């Protein structure tokens, strides 16, 4: 019966492939050919925040577009003030091997995690005038790659044990487990309506999940190597990925296939992070060749280059109002562009 | 600037003073990476070693230096996504078991991966060959033909040790890398000094390379 069930997989595989071709009558580049080009985008460095003594691995903006949080291998968690270049808090960490961080939408909590296989929650606005550990979440069997907040009592995490999970902070227990990947999960993006999210893993595939029901809806496979970054379109009906094959791709949900590919013949290094603009016209990506590129999301043309770092660029971010872009690197510095 | 603004900048300056003080203390430390297979001697490599899953960290003080050892064996995942964290380490310690005839060809394969990694082009390796008392009490019963079918030579213990060590040294293809070998037993209690000598010779070579002689 194993052979019959193995063959039934191939029968259902060709049906999905044939259905996608039946709904593909034109390409995005063909439709968008009669559009004026964006032009040349030039951005200058306005702020240079310094104080970290090792590599920076992650950062996250606040909702007010004023405050930041960054994580480094020196066991520190610093909250910055963009406008005046000031330090507000400095949080020591029990473990120095941290790989991700996040900022709560309400501005009351932050989180971090890494090779200790634990996600930690911190309380910022409290009496006694100091930051204190509020909760430690345990249960994963691999390192944490990413985490994002839904509200003050819910969080979603991805791990290197090929699983995703949804936690309740007060009870400290999982409520749903997301399974189906065959490789380590590296990235995670959350929809604006907080009802769906997507993930990218080392098996060169992306999956779309439903939070309420905990089941997989669609799967996307176009890359030739592992995926390092992922992000939604501002509308909520498309997303973009970045892989180690030196390529970014755009996927659509309703048509359920790929639309555009962003590649150049003189780029060999991989991609660390991706981000969009407020109108969804510019796509920003970070690379291992010390540079950050700006792409045209519709014409698939290169529009600008940001070059100010002496080491690998590892994290990106765009504010809610779309007024500035902040980049972090392995040279223990981060800059704000406008 | 307002009165409350001048009070904010003073708080920032005191924070920057604390960070600078913490960096100086952490700079005068020696960091080492501990690697090997299961049940090989990683956990009991130094008798005076204290502990202070994910990653296990142990530390000890010898002479006037502080040593930090990191063991990462509980990470049963892909190594290529987190191996670059330990890029600025001083050296690598690799432990192998001579008695286990089945752990070999897995220790050798793992040795080849780390020794030819992109992030460890110029990182020295200290090699430990454990359980020499059991190896000399097993070679008579098992003439090394199980682990190495293509082996011709005397069945003496000394010749077997020289053959195993040469197999591990054959995986090095680099001109700025050296391997220090040492054979130890379970009852031996002289291993902090062996690491002290190996680290001392590494810094001397590093300083010579900066001058340009070597």
């Amino acid at each position, epitope marked *: 019966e194993l052979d019959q069930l193995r063959q039934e997989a191939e029968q259902l595989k060709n049906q999905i492939r044939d259905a996608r071709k039946a709904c593909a009558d034109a390409t995005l580049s063909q439709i968008t050919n009669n559009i004026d080009p964006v032009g040349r985008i030039q951005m200058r460095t306005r702020r240079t925040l310094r104080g970290h003594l090792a590599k920076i691995y992650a950062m996250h903006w606040g909702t007010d577009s*004023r*405050l930041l949080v960054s994580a480094s291998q020196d066991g520190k968690l610093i909250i910055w*003030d963009s406008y005046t270049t*000031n330090k*507000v808090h400095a949080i020591p960490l029990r473990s120095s091997w941290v790989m991700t961080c996040a900022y709560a939408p309400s501005g009351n909590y932050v989180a971090c995690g890494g090779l200790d296989n634990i996600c930690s929650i911190y309380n910022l606005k409290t*009496r*006694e*005038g*100091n930051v204190r550990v509020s909760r430690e979440l345990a249960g994963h069997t691999g390192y944490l790659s990413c985490c994002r907040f839904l509200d003050d009592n819910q969080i979603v995490t991805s791990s290197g044990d090929t699983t995703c999970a949804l936690w309740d902070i007060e009870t400290g227990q999982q409520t749903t487990t997301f399974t189906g990947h065959t490789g380590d999960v590296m990235s995670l993006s959350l929809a604006p309506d907080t009802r769906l999210f997507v993930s990218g893993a080392c098996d060169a595939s992306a999956k779309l999940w439903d939070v309420r029901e905990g089941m997989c809806r669609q799967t996307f496979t176009g890359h030739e190597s592992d995926i390092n970054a992922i992000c939604f379109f501002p509308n909520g009906n498309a997303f973009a990925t970045g892989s180690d094959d030196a390529t970014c791709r755009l996927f659509d949900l309703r048509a359920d296939q790929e639309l555009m590919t962003y590649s150049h013949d003189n780029i060999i290094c991989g991609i660390t992070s991706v981000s969009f603009s407020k109108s969804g016209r510019l796509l920003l990506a970070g690379y291992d060749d010390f540079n950050c590129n700006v792409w045209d999301a519709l014409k698939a043309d290169r529009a600008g280059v940001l070059a100010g770092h002496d080491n690998r660029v590892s994290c990106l971010g765009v504010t809610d109002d779309g007024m500035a872009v902040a980049t972090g690197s392995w040279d223990s510095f981060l800059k704000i562009w406008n | 600037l*307002s*009165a*409350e*603004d001048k*009070a*904010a900048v*003073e*708080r920032s300056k*005191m924070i920057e003073k604390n960070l600078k003080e913490d960096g100086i203390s952490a700079a005068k430390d020696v960091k080492l990476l501990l690697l090997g297979a299961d049940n090989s001697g990683k956990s009991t490599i130094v008798k005076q070693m204290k502990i202070i899953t994910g990653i296990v960290e142990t530390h000890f003080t010898f002479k006037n230096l502080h040593f930090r050892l990191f063991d990462v064996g509980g990470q049963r995942s892909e190594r290529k996504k987190w191996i670059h964290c330990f890029e600025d380490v001083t050296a690598i310690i690799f432990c192998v078991d001579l008695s286990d005839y089945n752990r070999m060809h897995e220790s050798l394969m793992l040795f080849d991966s780390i020794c030819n990694n992109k992030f460890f082009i110029d990182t020295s390796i200290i090699l430990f060959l454990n359980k020499k008392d059991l190896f000399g009490e097993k070679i008579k019963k098992s003439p090394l033909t199980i682990c190495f079918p293509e082996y011709t030579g005397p069945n003496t213990y000394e010749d077997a040790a020289a053959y195993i060590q040469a197999q591990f040294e054959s995986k090095n293809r680099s001109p700025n890398k050296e391997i220090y070998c040492h054979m130890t037993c379970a009852t031996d209690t002289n291993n902090a000094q062996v690491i002290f000598d190996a680290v001392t010779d590494i810094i001397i070579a590093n300083n010579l390379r900066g001058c340009g002689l070597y």
Partner: single-chain antibody, 230 residues
């Protein structure tokens, strides 16, 4: 959080006295401290201030050259040394904590004080003194000689409430932000040189004296105070 002050007594004119305050419940070394005194039948008056880390010290013009302020972090204690005491120094002295960073609420905790018996500034005006008033809306006004709005977009005005027999409590900081633990029926709004505090659905535990205070520049100055009766 607790702040207990010790000292006090009766001292002849020309003498000296030392006052101390103890802290228990919060990170002491991260907070700045103030001394504020109130005459037996008058309002509030700022005296001295020492920064977190002991780098900035400020004094009022009345007590300059006679008073000295100091702190001892490991023992969590604040001191005030007084010399050449006159008859105008008879008052009740308070200890106030304040922390300064983006988004903080200074002057958020006061401590019960001690009584001592010895026997180019901004003017803040509270025209009204007493207003008789449950289940009603009341408004209190305030005025300043100099505009309290800075070029960064911040207006510095603080509202305090002091019930009889109790220390003052913070109500509104900046100009409109509501302090933690305060019911949502208190609102604060205004413009340059004109400010108003509004209470909706008045209830019990709302009778007392309301004070203005500006934090634009040193020395800090208060208002006369408006009293609610019945």
């Amino acid at each position: 959080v607790q702040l207990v002050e010790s000292g006090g007594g009766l001292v002849q004119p020309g003498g000296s006295r030392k006052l101390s305050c103890s802290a228990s419940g919060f990170a002491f070394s991260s907070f700045g401290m103030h001394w504020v005194r109130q005459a037996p039948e008058k309002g509030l008056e700022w005296v001295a201030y020492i920064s977190s880390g002991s780098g900035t010290i400020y004094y009022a013009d009345t007590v300059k050259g006679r008073f000295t302020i100091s702190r001892d972090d490991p023992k969590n204690t604040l001191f005030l040394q007084m010399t050449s005491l006159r008859s105008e120094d008879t008052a009740m002295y308070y200890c106030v904590r304040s922390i300064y960073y983006y988004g903080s609420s200074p002057f958020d905790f006061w401590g019960q004080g001690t009584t001592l018996t010895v026997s180019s500034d901004i003017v803040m005006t509270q025209a009204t003194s007493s207003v008789p008033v449950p289940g009603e809306s009341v408004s209190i006004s305030c005025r300043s000689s100099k505009s309290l709005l800075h070029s960064n977009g911040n207006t510095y005005l603080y509202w305090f409430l002091q019930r009889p027999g109790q220390s003052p409590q913070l109500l509104i900081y900046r100009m409109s932000n509501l302090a933690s633990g305060v019911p949502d029926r208190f609102s604060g709004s205004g413009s340059g040189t004109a400010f108003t505090l509004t209470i909706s659905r008045l209830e019990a535990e709302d009778v007392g004296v309301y004070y203005c205070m500006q934090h634009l520049e040193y020395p800090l100055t208060f208002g006369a105070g408006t009293k609610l009766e019945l």
